[PDB]
Design an enzyme around this catalytic site. Structure first.
Site, PDB file in Angstrom:
ATOM      1  CG  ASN A   1      24.150  24.431 -11.195  1.00  0.00           C
ATOM      2  OD1 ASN A   1      23.763  25.401 -10.542  1.00  0.00           O
ATOM      3  ND2 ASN A   1      25.275  24.453 -11.925  1.00  0.00           N
TER       4      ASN A   1
ATOM      5  NE  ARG B   1      28.538  28.626 -10.423  1.00  0.00           N
ATOM      6  CZ  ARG B   1      28.494  27.378 -10.887  1.00  0.00           C
ATOM      7  NH1 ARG B   1      28.243  27.132 -12.172  1.00  0.00           N
ATOM      8  NH2 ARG B   1      28.733  26.357 -10.055  1.00  0.00           N
TER       9      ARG B   1
ATOM     10  CB  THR C   1      -2.984  -3.486  -0.547  1.00  0.00           C
ATOM     11  OG1 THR C   1      -4.253  -3.157  -1.117  1.00  0.00           O
ATOM     12  CG2 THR C   1      -2.160  -4.367  -1.520  1.00  0.00           C
ATOM     13  CG  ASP C   2      -8.666  -2.524   3.274  1.00  0.00           C
ATOM     14  OD1 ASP C   2      -8.895  -1.361   2.867  1.00  0.00           O
ATOM     15  OD2 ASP C   2      -9.188  -3.029   4.297  1.00  0.00           O
TER      16      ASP C   2
ATOM     17  CG  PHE D   1      31.746  25.970 -13.215  1.00  0.00           C
ATOM     18  CD1 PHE D   1      32.252  24.895 -12.478  1.00  0.00           C
ATOM     19  CD2 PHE D   1      31.391  25.757 -14.557  1.00  0.00           C
ATOM     20  CE1 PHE D   1      32.393  23.639 -13.055  1.00  0.00           C
ATOM     21  CE2 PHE D   1      31.520  24.499 -15.135  1.00  0.00           C
ATOM     22  CZ  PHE D   1      32.041  23.437 -14.388  1.00  0.00           C
TER      23      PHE D   1
ATOM     24  CB  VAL E   1      27.467  21.671  -7.868  1.00  0.00           C
ATOM     25  CG1 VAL E   1      26.570  20.761  -7.066  1.00  0.00           C
ATOM     26  CG2 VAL E   1      26.737  22.969  -8.208  1.00  0.00           C
ATOM     27  CD  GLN E   2      30.554  18.907 -10.498  1.00  0.00           C
ATOM     28  OE1 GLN E   2      30.299  20.069 -10.174  1.00  0.00           O
ATOM     29  NE2 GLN E   2      30.395  18.448 -11.742  1.00  0.00           N
TER      30      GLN E   2
ATOM     31  CG  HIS F   1      21.489  26.627 -14.841  1.00  0.00           C
ATOM     32  ND1 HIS F   1      22.763  26.405 -14.368  1.00  0.00           N
ATOM     33  CD2 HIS F   1      21.068  25.448 -15.363  1.00  0.00           C
ATOM     34  CE1 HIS F   1      23.116  25.155 -14.634  1.00  0.00           C
ATOM     35  NE2 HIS F   1      22.099  24.549 -15.219  1.00  0.00           N
TER      36      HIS F   1
ATOM     37  CE  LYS G   1      -4.479   0.299   0.537  1.00  0.00           C
ATOM     38  NZ  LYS G   1      -5.286  -0.541  -0.412  1.00  0.00           N
TER      39      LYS G   1
HETATM   40  O1  LIG Z   1      29.027  23.615 -10.618  1.00  0.00           O
HETATM   41  C1  LIG Z   1      28.932  23.273 -11.811  1.00  0.00           C
HETATM   42  N1  LIG Z   1      29.263  22.005 -12.142  1.00  0.00           N
HETATM   43  C2  LIG Z   1      29.217  21.528 -13.392  1.00  0.00           C
HETATM   44  O2  LIG Z   1      29.509  20.350 -13.681  1.00  0.00           O
HETATM   45  C3  LIG Z   1      28.761  22.477 -14.429  1.00  0.00           C
HETATM   46  N2  LIG Z   1      28.597  22.371 -15.758  1.00  0.00           N
HETATM   47  N3  LIG Z   1      28.138  23.602 -16.188  1.00  0.00           N
HETATM   48  N4  LIG Z   1      28.028  24.493 -15.128  1.00  0.00           N
HETATM   49  C4  LIG Z   1      28.406  23.839 -14.009  1.00  0.00           C
HETATM   50  N5  LIG Z   1      28.489  24.197 -12.715  1.00  0.00           N
HETATM   51  O1  LIG Z   2      -6.036  -7.005  -6.895  1.00  0.00           O
HETATM   52  C1  LIG Z   2      -5.799  -6.824  -5.686  1.00  0.00           C
HETATM   53  N1  LIG Z   2      -4.620  -7.265  -5.192  1.00  0.00           N
HETATM   54  C2  LIG Z   2      -4.261  -7.142  -3.909  1.00  0.00           C
HETATM   55  O2  LIG Z   2      -3.162  -7.538  -3.470  1.00  0.00           O
HETATM   56  C3  LIG Z   2      -5.237  -6.470  -3.026  1.00  0.00           C
HETATM   57  N2  LIG Z   2      -5.237  -6.179  -1.714  1.00  0.00           N
HETATM   58  N3  LIG Z   2      -6.434  -5.535  -1.464  1.00  0.00           N
HETATM   59  N4  LIG Z   2      -7.200  -5.435  -2.618  1.00  0.00           N
HETATM   60  C4  LIG Z   2      -6.497  -6.004  -3.620  1.00  0.00           C
HETATM   61  N5  LIG Z   2      -6.739  -6.181  -4.931  1.00  0.00           N
END
Ligand SMILES: O=c1[nH]c(=O)c2nn[nH]c2[nH]1
Ligand SMILES: O=c1[nH]c(=O)c2nn[nH]c2[nH]1
Ligand SMILES: O=c1[nH]c(=O)c2nn[nH]c2[nH]1
Ligand SMILES: O=c1[nH]c(=O)c2nn[nH]c2[nH]1
Ligand code: NA
Ligand code: NA
Ligand code: NA
Ligand code: NA
Lengths: 295, 295, 295, 295
Positions: free
Chosen positions: B254, B176, B57-58, B159, B227-228, B256, B10
């Site tokens: 990043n 920048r 799942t209920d 950069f 950034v790296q 821009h 679920k």
């Molecule tokens: O910080 C940055 N890392 C990158 O790899 C990059 N490529 N373009 N601008 C950038 N700025």
């Molecule tokens: O098709 C279903 N599968 C499930 O596992 C399930 N559990 N509740 N209702 C359901 N319906």
């Protein structure tokens, strides 16, 4: 057929501006998304393929950048008013400009207990927005807002005494979770033009701060009878603190958290006073709106 | 044909839990999204329509709620280990459980300078996550992470000195903007079982806090060559501060921000030392990854 | 500390290509999003700030456009193999390229019953994808997939005979709605290099079409005992029809539609045989996976 | 302070309905998302914490399901009118209902050239929508729309002759790509009530089909002078074919695809007549709107 209404322009223009204080070395950044739509004597572009009346949307984009280069971009109410006024003054046949600005948060980082000069964090997707309508001969209408402010209280919310009929299954409650995303808009009195907007510049940031503070405090402190009642209290306080606001509008989802009955499993008690684990509901949601103005 | 691998369960199970301190009146909330996938002797459900081997799942959903009711949900490394162990112990034919937990922020509000007892704000979409693999006879493998931490620095990033050939147009730069969304994962040494996970409980929150603090400080303080190079410095420090971590992996976009040449317009200067207004780019983006382990 | 793994490159590179037939006037468009990540002798960029080993991500972006200009972009398995091979052949110190391509639908419009020469519609967000890993001395590994294929059947799905214990509340059923978003991946036998990929070019589009057709027909015609059983039938058929496929993997959400008991309201009957109105559930969802290979 | 406007209700109510023909065995499914907001004499819930005037949003949700059980859900204009009328008739103090419906596509599968009786595919995220405002004493106002219809033409679009000034950098062009997401709304003449809406039931599906067909054909066939000129042609035709429509509104983004100059690389020619590879732009985008009515 006839053109009843038309507007056109550029949407989703992302803009960043940096201010560098040479004395202190401190840098401050602003980032916005801007939309500008124009109206005027442009019907012939639609009806006759007459492009001569069209200020190209690409040119509108350039204008936004140029305007941000030559003017302050804060408060956004001022920047929006400058930008809208430009179009109605520059082009004889353009008679209205509609400017929407969304301001994104870049909050200065605190590193080891001190404010860093040039490093920022996006603390939440809460936005501060402006809608500015500049209409030739009718001045400048500004609506300011905050949006995307998401809050939750785990108690001190009630909901009882509502209408019960044959469509009703909801149980009354004296203790529930209340959670919402706040959208709050305050509409300023009409301004005659740019000089008047400039004269009120300090009020814009202060009123935003007040709206935010009132919203948070009221939410946290009100023993809430309903979303309706709590939101009205918020709006009332904002109107009381800023006389240049004409109306306050709130639009609030009620984001439900449901109790889970686990009593089928070994008599486990998880409802009412014993409720500890709840299931947040993605949908549906209540939606409650109100516009509050002056007597 | 034959079943080579199978898992099922679920996903997207939203869970909220509240803790109420009766003495102080203080409430604390936790909200998570949980996924549990099971493996084991279940091939016949696929090949022969034999549903007898299927834990519905209920039922998995119910188990998540019951487990949250009866156990602490924090730190998530512990909750995940409890939940995974349950399935392999309860069902003879289930031999592995894979538990993914995303923790959402609910930060206590400060109202008038004091912590509020039961009101919370979502301050950013940053998440704290766990992946827990519980495999019968092979113990418990835990990967902890933070994600959605969005930062920007407006200077002190460079950069230059990269490979230049006939595919290269990028100009070298000594100043920048650098902005990224941080995804950082630390992988714990294998644990023999639940008793061992319990014995290390205090290390989980502390290591998350350390990873976050190292990430923020290094980003803010490094005069970054790429950034790296900056990301390697982060990973090195985390490994130095927690001996029970085997590897640290960073995955960094990043994001821009491009200069805008405005010189076509009245000789306006907006590049190099004069750059004030930039255009954030939604796409494409650089993507830089590294996994750092011990000598 | 030591670098255990590293890869870097450019993500989210949007590319459009048009083919114009001068004879017939017919135009055909292709639109893709491409990611290329490189590995090789690049550790020193991380550990020593040695940028001399870095092919800039900006250059990788340029290379994608140049490669699309000079080569066919369809089938994507071929384009991906050309693009990956380029990097390992051009740069002595780059030893692996990992290319991911997402193909977006632009389907020719039919206007008045005839195919239009240059107008297209996006009919659904279904994607055709490729992952190509080109590793120096180890050939070319290709995984092809379709994703975002959303289907629903309103009857002829059952689910009974599953394990029942003290965690189980789910009722057995002989008639339910079944809806899913299909993610299906077929992995090709390893290819020795580009010449071998070229030799099999016709098989790529044909196998995609077969995978799609088998998925749709099996879903529609199987009186389904479970998602597990129906998905296995799909995978078995694909493997039978294409001997150059080694494995087929399906990952299927079970998107639930719940009955709504309306009997509290005037005895309205809306369950079992009388069920007409249902509530689609956004979350949680079942998630069922299987990888099927050859005996 | 005073309440100037208020409305409240339930949003994001997902509904599925199946129709089963016992004679032929053919099943037909409908899936919608519904929002209902009410207005009336409800100010006291805001100002005095008087919940007695509140029809709980949970009850509104129940009403939507009950109404879908007892009535046809197609065409959505009819279902919306039934649902809105219910609230104003049932509750004396509710005077307006605002109903928004989004209809999701479930298109019958063709398997081996024949329509399948109970299997469906989501072919695109295009939606058919309705907004219905039912106001006591003022009848029923309906706006019908289609949205999310994404199209592209690779030639037969031009844009030249626009205003050029010191803000303009855009080059005139006689051959460009045109791509948009169509949002088209037609507003019906006011209806006196439900009996009148029922009397026009056949016109609703027919007008939707006509709006769609006119949009697609005009886009494909017009040698477009601008988005403005092409969209006006669409609106004119719709108004000509359905006399009960008062206005047609289009809102169209201009989704740009930029040429890529590759001449820096070995003199590669990829601009103007030689343009084959383009870069789709995620943002910004032109936004062009028009409302067309009758002379
Ligand atoms: O910080 C940055 N890392 C990158 O790899 C990059 N490529 N373009 N601008 C950038 N700025
Ligand atoms: O098709 C279903 N599968 C499930 O596992 C399930 N559990 N509740 N209702 C359901 N319906
Ligand atoms: O069709 C267009 N209309 C416009 O208004 C415009 N402005 N720039 N490009 C454009 N294309
Ligand atoms: O605060 C609330 N207001 C409402 O109108 C409502 N309706 N259901 N629950 C509710 N809660
Ligand atoms: Na003007
Ligand atoms: Na077991
Ligand atoms: Na190489
Ligand atoms: Na009424």
């Amino acid at each position: 057929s006839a053109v009843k209404a038309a507007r056109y322009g550029k949407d989703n223009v992302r803009v960043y501006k940096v201010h560098k204080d040479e004395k202190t070395g401190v840098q401050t950044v602003y980032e916005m998304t801007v939309c500008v739509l124009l109206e005027g004597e442009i019907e012939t572009s639609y009806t006759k393929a007459d492009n001569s009346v069209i200020v190209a949307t690409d040119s509108i984009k350039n204008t936004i950048y140029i305007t941000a280069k030559q003017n302050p971009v804060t408060p956004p109410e001022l920047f929006g008013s400058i930008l809208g006024t430009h179009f109605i003054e520059k082009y004889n046949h353009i008679h209205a400009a509609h400017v929407n600005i969304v301001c994104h948060r870049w909050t200065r980082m605190d590193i080891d207990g001190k404010p860093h000069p040039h490093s920022f964090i996006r603390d939440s997707e809460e936005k501060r927005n402006v809608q500015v309508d500049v209409v030739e001969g009718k001045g400048i209408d500004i609506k300011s807002s905050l949006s995307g402010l998401t809050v939750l209280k785990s108690t001190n919310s009630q909901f009882w005494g509502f209408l019960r009929d044959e469509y009703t299954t909801l149980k009354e409650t004296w203790d529930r979770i209340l959670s919402t995303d706040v959208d709050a808009t305050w509409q300023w009195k009409n301004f005659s033009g740019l000089q008047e907007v400039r004269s009120h510049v300090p009020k814009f940031d202060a009123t935003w701060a007040t709206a935010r503070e009132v919203t948070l405090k009221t939410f946290a402190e009100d023993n809430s009878a309903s979303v309706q009642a709590t939101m009205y209290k918020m709006a009332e306080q904002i109107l009381a603190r800023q006389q240049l606001i004409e109306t306050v509008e709130y639009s609030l989802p009620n984001k439900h958290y449901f109790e889970i009955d686990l009593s089928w499993h070994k008599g486990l008690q998880n409802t009412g006073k014993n409720a500890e684990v709840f299931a947040p509901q993605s949908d549906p949601n209540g939606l409650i709106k109100c516009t509050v103005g002056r007597s």
